[PDB]
Design a protein around this ligand. Structure first.
Ligand SMILES: N[C@@H](CCC(=O)N[C@@H](CS)C(=O)NCC(=O)O)C(=O)O
Lengths: 281, 281
């Protein structure tokens, strides 16, 4: 039973040993490898990385935010998670040309593409009922009616909506697989920072997978995490090596409390992470 | 230095070792796995599988057909290739509620998504100029003006059009990467028939890289093939055991003899494969 988090570190161990310098948008350098993959068992465990703390409240409150279909940052900020706010800020908007938008309007980001892929996006307050493809609900329905399906895919990459978004999607598309009553989910991340984001992402889709599994009566199977530009900031190479020598502690467990039957019904108070003991720093 | 095809074979084996039983949309039953990723170097060699020749006339002629934006199966038919005409016969079209459609009208498939993502669809023979998002050119433009971009993506998976298609895209999305003046490409393939498809698209996208490289002046790097539901059809199990023994012969080499600018200008005669000595047919 080799710890799952070992697959993760292995990727860093690998980016170091084999990666090369590639500068990002702001000119800042990174060491990176293009195209990677990792698999995580969702069976009785829950891949909430222990070799460093993962902002789980952010993972959970944001996912719940994505499900509502919200695109208004303040609506997220409200619950304590302040990570999108910087994109829905006044100045940031006026700068991308969205001077006409009210503060908080991120555009057709994850939420929108998730529940209304295709609908003409108007404001962060337009009513979108019945408009655009509701991928989330559709993935769910498919899993129930036709679990063998090889097309249970949710996709946030809307070439059309791109120039209207606060920033491109990172988790472009995810695929759901069902076999032997187990539900798996692969996620394609175009770009991920192995150090800060990825651990969060691994958590998000693991959470999401636990959810749909619950709603449909399946046992969480595996979580395949696939990347495009997996990278690390050169200015972090040290903080990271000090981490690779760290030994992974057994992955906590996610336990859903009440029996939720609809995905929109899930509330924060329904999840409990137990046994999460990560290495401080 | 390990030989390239070892990848694809090693996957055939693993799908045999662990490939769990799972049926398709015809109950044909298969040995399936979910979440795989192979890496193929495109440096000086071309990955055209040798333990079983690959219909190159198709790989090349179809990709060209894609680039054209042609959603007519006869168009790819006239060129001496018939693999997308079955889906355009007649009983088939009506078989999906598509009666009003001409003979050979495939719907918003690949080509249309590559050159007109988002453009309201009509019929195989109508003009979509200045319509949609011309991802393909947009990708190349970007490869040239910003090789660092972590969002160089072409997506054929459109939830809105998915209903008007014959078969939904197996080539969900692909991502291009540049570094050290090298162009790499990762393709996300949702489902894949290991013994009759996988080889065909590996090359198909490898070819695509080589083309874009030639017009962007970058040199081919590696093609990353990521799979979702990677399967082996039950019957295919025996032939694959004997094809699985055939020892791999050196990858051929693709030579773009002529020299072109735009991508809408390549032609079947502009390519050559040498060193391609396939195993007995
Ligand atoms: N937007 C950057 C990439 C930024 C990136 O990968 N950020 C990580 C955080 S360090 C992320 O977006 N994570 C999103 C999530 O975990 O949901 C680019 O493509 O140039």
């Amino acid at each position: 039973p080799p710890h799952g988090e070992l697959q993760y570190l292995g990727q860093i161990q690998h980016i170091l040993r084999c990666g090369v310098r590639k500068d990002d948008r702001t000119g800042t350098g990174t060491l990176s490898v293009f195209g990677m993959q990792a698999r995580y068992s969702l069976r009785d465990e829950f891949p909430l990385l222990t070799t460093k703390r993962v902002f789980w409240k952010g993972v959970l409150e944001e996912l719940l935010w994505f499900i509502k279909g919200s695109t208004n940052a303040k609506e997220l900020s409200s619950k304590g998670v302040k990570i999108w706010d910087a994109n829905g800020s006044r100045d940031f908007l006026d700068s991308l040309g969205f001077s006409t938008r009210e503060e908080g309007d991120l555009g057709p980001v994850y939420g929108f593409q998730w529940r209304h892929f295709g609908a003409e996006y108007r404001d962060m307050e337009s009513d979108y009922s019945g408009q655009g493809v509701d991928q989330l609900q559709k993935v769910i329905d498919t899993i129930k009616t036709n679990p063998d399906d090889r097309r249970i895919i949710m996709c946030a990459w809307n070439p059309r909506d791109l120039p209207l978004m606060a920033l491109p999607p990172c988790h472009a598309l995810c695929q759901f697989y069902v076999v032997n009553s187990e539900l798996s989910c692969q996620l394609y991340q175009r770009s991920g920072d192995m150090g800060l984001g990825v651990p969060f992402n691994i958590a998000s889709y693991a959470l999401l997978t636990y959810m749909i599994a619950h709603i449909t009566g399946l046992k969480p199977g595996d979580f395949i995490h696939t990347l495009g530009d997996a990278h690390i900031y050169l200015n972090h190479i040290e903080p990271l090596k000090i981490q690779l020598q760290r030994e992974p502690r057994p992955f906590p467990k996610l336990r859903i409390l009440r029996k939720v039957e609809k995905i929109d019904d899930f509330k924060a108070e329904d999840f409990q992470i137990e046994g999460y003991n990560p290495h401080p720093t």
